[PDB]
Paper text:
HVEM is a TNF (tumor necrosis factor) receptor contributing to a broad range of immune functions involving diverse cell types. It interacts with a TNF ligand, LIGHT, and immunoglobulin (Ig) superfamily members BTLA and CD160. HVEM engages in bidirectional signaling, serving not only as a receptor but also as a ligand for IgSF receptor signaling. To dissect the molecular basis for multiple functions, we determined crystal structures that reveal the distinct HVEM surfaces that engage LIGHT or BTLA/CD160, including the human HVEM–LIGHT–CD160 ternary complex, with HVEM interacting simultaneously with both binding partners.
Within the ternary assembly, hHVEM and hLIGHT exhibit the classical 3:3 TNF–TNFR assembly, with contacts that are very similar to the structure of the hHVEM–hLIGHT binary complex described above. The hHVEM–hLIGHT complex forms the core of the ternary complex, with each hHVEM CRD1 further binding a single molecule of hCD160 in a manner similar to that observed in the structure of the hHVEM–hCD160 binary complex. Notably, the structures of hHVEM–hLIGHT–hCD160 and hHVEM–hCD160 complexes relied on the use of a single chain hCD160–hHVEM fusion protein, as the relatively weak interaction of hCD160–hHVEM (7.1 ± 0.9 µM) does not support the stable complex formation in solution. The crystal structure of the hHVEM–hLIGHT–hCD160 complex provides direct evidence that hLIGHT and hCD160 can simultaneously engage hHVEM, resulting in a higher-order assembly with the potential of coordinated signaling through both hHVEM and hCD160. Crystal structures of hHVEM in complex with hBTLA and hCD160 highlight an anti-parallel intermolecular β-strand interaction, in which the β-strand composed of residues G72-P77 from CRD1 in hHVEM contacts the edge β-strands in hBTLA and hCD160 through canonical main-chain-to-main-chain β-sheet hydrogen bonds. This pattern of hCD160 interactions with hHVEM is conserved in the ternary hHVEM–hLIGHT–hCD160 complex. The recognition interfaces in the ternary hHVEM–hLIGHT–hCD160 complex are similar to those in the binary hHVEM–hCD160 and hHVEM–hLIGHT complexes, suggesting that little molecular accommodation is required for HVEM to simultaneously engage two types of binding partners.
Residue numbers in the entry:
A (entry chain B), B (entry chain A), C (entry chain C): 92 to 155, 159 to 187, 192 to 240
D (entry chain D), E (entry chain F), F (entry chain E): 27 to 81, 91 to 133, 136 to 142, 1040 to 1140
The structure:
Amino acid sequence: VNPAAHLTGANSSLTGSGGPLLWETQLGLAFLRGLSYHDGALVVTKAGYYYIYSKVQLGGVGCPASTITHGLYKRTPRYPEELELLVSQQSPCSSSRVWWDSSFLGGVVHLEAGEEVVVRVLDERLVRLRDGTRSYFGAFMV
Amino acid sequence: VNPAAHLTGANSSLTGSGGPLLWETQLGLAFLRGLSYHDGALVVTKAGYYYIYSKVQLGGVGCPASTITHGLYKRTPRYPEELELLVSQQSPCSSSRVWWDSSFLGGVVHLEAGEEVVVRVLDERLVRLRDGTRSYFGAFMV
Amino acid sequence: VNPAAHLTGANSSLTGSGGPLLWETQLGLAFLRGLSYHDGALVVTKAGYYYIYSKVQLGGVGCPASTITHGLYKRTPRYPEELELLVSQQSPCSSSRVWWDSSFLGGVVHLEAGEEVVVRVLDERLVRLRDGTRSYFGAFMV
Amino acid sequence: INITSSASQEGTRLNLICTVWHKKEEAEGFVVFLCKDRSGDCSPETSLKQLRLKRISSQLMFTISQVTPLHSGTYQCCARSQKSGIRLQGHFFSILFTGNYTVTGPSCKEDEYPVGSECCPKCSPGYRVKEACGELTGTVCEPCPPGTYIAHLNGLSKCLQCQMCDPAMGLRASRNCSRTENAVCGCSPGHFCIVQDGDHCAACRA
Amino acid sequence: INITSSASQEGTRLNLICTVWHKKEEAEGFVVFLCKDRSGDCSPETSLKQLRLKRISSQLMFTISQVTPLHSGTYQCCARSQKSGIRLQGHFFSILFTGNYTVTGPSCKEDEYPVGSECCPKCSPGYRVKEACGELTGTVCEPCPPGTYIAHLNGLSKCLQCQMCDPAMGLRASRNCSRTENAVCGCSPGHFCIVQDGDHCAACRA
Amino acid sequence: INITSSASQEGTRLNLICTVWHKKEEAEGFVVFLCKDRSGDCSPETSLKQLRLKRISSQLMFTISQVTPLHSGTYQCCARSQKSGIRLQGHFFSILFTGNYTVTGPSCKEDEYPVGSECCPKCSPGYRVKEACGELTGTVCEPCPPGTYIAHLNGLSKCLQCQMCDPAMGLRASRNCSRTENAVCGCSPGHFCIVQDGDHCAACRA
Ligand SMILES: *[C@@H]1O[C@H](CO)[C@@H](O[C@@H]2O[C@H](CO)[C@@H](O[C@@H]3O[C@H](CO)[C@@H](O)[C@H](O)[C@@H]3O)[C@H](O)[C@H]2NC(C)=O)[C@H](O)[C@H]1NC(C)=O
Ligand SMILES: *[C@@H]1O[C@H](CO)[C@@H](O[C@@H]2O[C@H](CO)[C@@H](O[C@@H]3O[C@H](CO)[C@@H](O)[C@H](O)[C@@H]3O)[C@H](O)[C@H]2NC(C)=O)[C@H](O)[C@H]1NC(C)=O
Ligand SMILES: *[C@@H]1O[C@H](CO)[C@@H](O[C@@H]2O[C@H](CO)[C@@H](O[C@@H]3O[C@H](CO)[C@@H](O)[C@H](O)[C@@H]3O)[C@H](O)[C@H]2NC(C)=O)[C@H](O)[C@H]1NC(C)=O
Ligand SMILES: *[C@@H]1O[C@H](CO)[C@@H](O[C@@H]2O[C@H](CO)[C@@H](O)[C@H](O)[C@H]2NC(C)=O)[C@H](O)[C@H]1NC(C)=O
Ligand SMILES: *[C@@H]1O[C@H](CO)[C@@H](O[C@@H]2O[C@H](CO)[C@@H](O)[C@H](O)[C@H]2NC(C)=O)[C@H](O)[C@H]1NC(C)=O
Ligand SMILES: *[C@@H]1O[C@H](CO)[C@@H](O[C@@H]2O[C@H](CO)[C@@H](O)[C@H](O)[C@H]2NC(C)=O)[C@H](O)[C@H]1NC(C)=O
């Protein structure tokens, strides 16, 4: 039973208190298989090598730092800080014009049993959540 | 024999009649393994969880709706409408200047046996097909 | 033991002599499993179908060809030229303003035993290497 | 909770028998009913005959006294539980007249969705598949939870997630998400349309 | 369709024997031939000797009457089918003189591509590998289908896909896609070059 | 290379026994030592007693002559190899006084990281986990390779990769990457700050 998961954007996704993006796990397209979920984080059951990914839909009515960071982060008892795994820097944007930009990344990382993975967009304000088919976060063992 | 496939942009890709993007299956880099193809759609043989993906090369000589939708859609007898799975909104573009923008997405979705998946770019006119190594659509079971 | 690998940007990445991008294999997030590495190239041990991918972080202080090519290429004794597999064309950029753009692609390609895969960004000057969590190249068998 | 469909015959008469199963004394507000030629529009209001229960096996019996051409069609045993909110869809069986007559019931009908070799009756709009139809058993249908919807006769195992109208894009819910309709987004109090994605506003400014 | 290479010896003479297999009575327009020192440029026009067939095992025999230094080189048994369009590439074997002489045939030659332990003769430009060379068997080569091409001596199992010149970028096919050349894109009737990607126009305006 | 911790008792006395394993005649510059109440700050400089070796099983013995309250605490057997450059972290055991006393050693201590059911002593800053602590065995720690670093008491199996300061962004290494600190980026000779990402310059112009 190969560990797999796909989590979707929700109404509580944007804590915006320096908290990582939260995700839906059961409703519609969301699912977990051999992976737990705790406070915005995929939680590894079976240790090993996982292809991890995340898309985030970005946009707005014009521009408020143009540099915007979207990344995947390891939490672990093996280190007191978060560990950057896969990270992108965009800069898509007067404020008279509306704009949209998707930001996808994925990659194979090694995860020990109990180690967590979270998504962080650096200016949460710019995250646009419509129906959750626009922004997601998941993984599968390889 | 783990179901896998990778399909490439073709001369008939842009039906542009509200039809989904069509793909090549046998020529060059294109292939099917344990997956059928019918009228622009990957067709599931073995039911289960598939990582699905699509890249589309976009560009042109300037700009004609700047908002442009690139998505992966489920067809099924279990619902009369198409079901959005994974979708992005871009806005890359006077018309004096030439531009290019790639749009990639992927994600793990559950597919029952006989269920179809298609790609749709909302303004097909902006799809730039060169050798088919620029635009593609495929999947593999996870 | 399913072949997998994830390689990260290094200080020698930008040879910039018409050479392909070089990668780190052992340090930090980098790893090889059932795949060899030779002169910027993943080297297949076990022949078959691989999902291959690459992200590159791009940016700079303004603009010097705006069209920029990021692609995955097959080397093989079966053909004297390199073979394009998966390729994107971007155009993200006066020079007064700083900008960042990530370029990700992935796809399933068939690779015979001993066949190589490399990454090429067409203007290496635009590749921005920070900690190697910004730019990477890897694969896993499907 | 079980549903069955049987058709016993005695001389000139022909009995159609919907059989229903439910927890004793939770049947108050429970209805079993039969439908002739209802394209998944089957309800007590559109039934031939019904039995509203009052308080573990329940039964509905519709007897056809004479074999006639106009009684030919497609019948469906259906149940509805008030306390549960659960619907129940029995298999599509057919009467066909020729002189003679025969009962009956891979190219499943519009109202059905395929499950292995078998076909299964679809669930109502705003109703999710709780249990697949057995060979003898019928389709069980739970109502969509709040924040979800299904807008069609469906065989979906999970309800579609309602669209949120983004305040920060100057949008508000023009129509609220009912369990049979998605929500729709128009412009906020004192905002106007910038661009449209379809016949709806994508983003609004004040 | 099989190909073999054998070299029988009798006193002073030395016979080289290309052996070919084909469906009886579909050999009209069929040619088996031998090549000395042809770097995959081997053809009837560049053969030492050939046998054009007319109408299941066929044979070509080239006898060397005397052992001499100038007969030393690298030989190849090759067959061409007209009706099929299929080429056939036998293994690269060598004659070497010293006084004495020896016949012969992991660092495969330029004209070969590795397959497991063995090496295999490459297919002609515009020719795809239909079947890998066996230990005794030779490389089989199908011609590229239309809309595809291979521009080199190759061991590819599938032909490269021809590039489409995008009308909407004001481009047209300067050169059409032959089975040995990719198509090339220049500007449309009454259009000019905006930017160039190499020594070709990327996009054109009128 | 093995590490063990045993505590033998005889009348009034109590012996603590660090046991170390090493290749014969590669022990020159080798140190085994014991630490009372060191929060992973355990070193020869902060040891109770040590044994610097000179030249396969080695041993350190610290005897407590009398059972007293002030001898109560948390002890750790540690070893340091000069030639290998490897640290060695034995399990955290405890003496507790009450009258009486007891020796001891899922909510692992700050200095530990969990591995299955067990807890393991963390490695020093600039030291990677070479081998996980066994039930009897201790944590083995390799130093970080060049171009990498770890800036904390850690249980990481691989060192963090040092940040490169991009010349093309007008940046240079303000601080160089030590094995215990990441590198830091300031502006190049004759360049100034454009924007800041934290308390460091993101990009510089001249
Ligand atoms: C969609 O549903 C929401 C509720 O989930 C609707 O917003 C609600 O509308 C009601 C009725 O107008 C509001 O009632 C109000 O109560 C105040 C007292 O605080 C009273 O002074 C007003 O006269 C009014 O009756 C209610 O406040 C509001 N709910 C919330 C939480 O704000 C919404 O109107 C619906 N949308 C559409 C377009 O139907
Ligand atoms: C590449 O191949 C295409 C065909 O696949 C070439 O277009 C074709 O060119 C021929 C020869 O000029 C055209 O023939 C014409 O027929 C009309 C009658 O309708 C006659 O009046 C003209 O005098 C001319 O002979 C043919 O129409 C055209 N094919 C199509 C379908 O339009 C193309 O020219 C080739 N490109 C190059 C640069 O060689
Ligand atoms: C971080 O480390 C690098 C070395 O990896 C430091 O650059 C090096 O600095 C030394 C000491 O200033 C340079 O030595 C010089 O040698 C020349 C002779 O060629 C002499 O004329 C100078 O007086 C000077 O002593 C050395 O050249 C240089 N290394 C390289 C390869 O250029 C760097 O300074 C360190 N950064 C910081 C901020 O500490
Ligand atoms: C549908 O449900 C009813 C009630 O649950 C079934 O009758 C029960 O069947 C089980 C298993 O055969 C028996 O253990 C019980 O004794 C029955 N319960 C009662 C109270 O009679 C019935 O068999 C089912 N019908 C179909 C066709 O599946
Ligand atoms: C190449 O092909 C020929 C013809 O197909 C082979 O001869 C046949 O071999 C099969 C299997 O050994 C026999 O069943 C047939 O009787 C043969 N056919 C005829 C008509 O003779 C030949 O063995 C092959 N040569 C090599 C070296 O593989
Ligand atoms: C730690 O290491 C020492 C030395 O390697 C171990 O002693 C050896 O144990 C192996 C396996 O039991 C024996 O084959 C050897 O004979 C021993 N070597 C010598 C030279 O004595 C010791 O058992 C280990 N201690 C623990 C607690 O794991």
